[model samples]
Target: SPEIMKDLSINFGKALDTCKKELDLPDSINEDFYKFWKEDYEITNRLTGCAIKCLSEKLEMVDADGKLHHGNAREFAMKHGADDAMAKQLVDLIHGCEKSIPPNDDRCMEVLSIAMCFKKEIHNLKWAPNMEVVVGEVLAEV
Candidate 1:
């Protein structure tokens, strides 16, 4: 299928800016209790939280306590162009990592590895190979 490289470019630009904004915030200890397992957490975890929060907000998948609503996430993924199967995968991928992060899963990294891919989905604007370059450019920030 044909594609519009500019649209993906614009979407990614927004995601990256949000990531940087998340990165710039001060670390937290006792705040947003449910989002963190404990008071002591790293800047990376904080950044990950921001990435998760921003994505959830964009998709309207977050609850009042900032927890992800799985059904909404999956639906939003599809609305953003992910096919049924891939949308399910993205829902699992995002919510699994976002919910368990910060003291649960230690394998994830500073920039939130999943966020890059989430942005990739948003940038791709649909399920296709058309936006790999744009995805690569965004992933380079990791």
Candidate 2:
């Protein structure tokens, strides 16, 4: 059930390389990105947010308004092994995070806040994946 979120996260993380090159991100960003599952480490880099945005766009998860496209996001989650209910809950989680944060002129910062909020919620629900296994799987694919 909740493991679907972990599976989705691992699948999503596998695309980081393409987004990294698309954004021309620095290696330092890797530290922030890969540490997402760690409870102690916070992702503070704005570029990480930019990379996340890029990945989301590549997957067509975001709408033209730069917000989560509910229908597409639900489709994505289901495609990645989430059931209908889980997909709906995933969309609600992201939408809730977006609404909870104040709007920012910097889209990257805005995304970062939303991401942090989402990560916290995931962790609270014990849905965060094991970073060691996640990184290993991602690297194996590359």
Candidate 3:
């Protein structure tokens, strides 16, 4: 999956390289970029070169249609996150808190994981202070 790898690769290969070159970083450190970028194991905390962790549901929010528009993803996650079982099991953990890290419980962790996984950065959620996201199939090809 080069697309997936490519998604994160630019951050590792180019964005970082440009930063180092601009900062005049030593070649010794520069040479080890790929090794450092690939974390020995997956984990949270970008500083450690690991992807932030999330439960599978969190990672599944967005549909693969790929418009960067999350209609389908939003609807699906919201529906699931609002259910009695999922609500009890998943959404309740966050307690609806936003703008920061959540409690590290299973529910909050799962909800937050889905939220975080929906977007690499929080900005990608396309929040408008009051509007909500809904996920549905694109009528046309995404």
Candidate 4:
């Protein structure tokens, strides 16, 4: 169900927060990160991409080359409440996004582009959660 994707998406931010200080992310990241959940907001911060890379590494979801580690990513999805098929589909979507974007000399920019592509795919599938609910739940835990 789409709820699975929504739950996974919400948790992704929670995990990203764990790496915040280590990455020395700016306060503006808080605003830009959640904006991805909203349809009209475009996330252009380069740090946002760096944050995604940091989060992916912390989750062990990417390889040394900074590409998605399919098995680990699938496991991550399953750990986040996605069923087997849903996990596979999620991984596939990310892979598709990776392919869609042109490579960049700055890997962070590459990751950011892929992330935006993935965000669009999620929104198109109606898998994005409500921004208010996501922010509220995340803050409630703080």
| Model 3: how far residue 104 lies from native, Å | 20
Residue 78, candidate 4: how far off, in angstroms?
A: 2.7
Tens-place lDDT digits, model 3, residues 17-121:
454455555556555533322322222323212111211222333233242232223333343233344323222322233324453544424433443333232
* Candidates sorted by TM-score, best first: 2, 4, 1, 3
Winner on lDDT between 1 and 4 is: 4
How far does residue 116 in candidate 4 sit from its true spot (Å)? 1.5
Error of 2 at 55 (Å): 2.2
For every model shown, what is its TM-score relative to the native structure? 0.33, 0.58, 0.23, 0.57
Better of 3 and 4 by TM-score: 4
For all candidates in order, the CA lDDT equals 0.41, 0.53, 0.31, 0.52
The RMSD of every model to the true structure, in order and in angstroms, is: 12.0, 8.2, 13.8, 8.5
- Clashing residue pairs in candidate 3 are 58-114, 71-134, 71-135, 71-136, 72-135, 72-136, 74-135, 75-134, 75-135, 93-108
Q: Which whole-number lDDT from 0 to 100 does residue 12 have in model 2? A: 53
lDDT, candidate 4, 1-142, per-residue tens: 4434534445555666676777777667776666675765667777766665565455442123232242344443444444477656655666666566666466567765655565566668856534432222212211
Query: CA shift at 88, candidate 3, in angstroms?
Result: 15
- lDDT string, candidate 1, 1-142, tens digits: 5574544435544654565465564234213422322222233465555554454344331122222243443333343455577656555554554555565443235235555445444445553422332222222222
Q: Which residue pairs does candidate 2 place in steric collision?
A: none
- What is the clash count of model 2? 0
Candidate 2 stretches greater than 4 Å from native: 1-15, 37-40, 60-71, 79-81, 126-142
Better-scoring candidate (TM-score), 1 or 3: 1
How many steric overlaps are in each model, in order?
0, 0, 10, 0
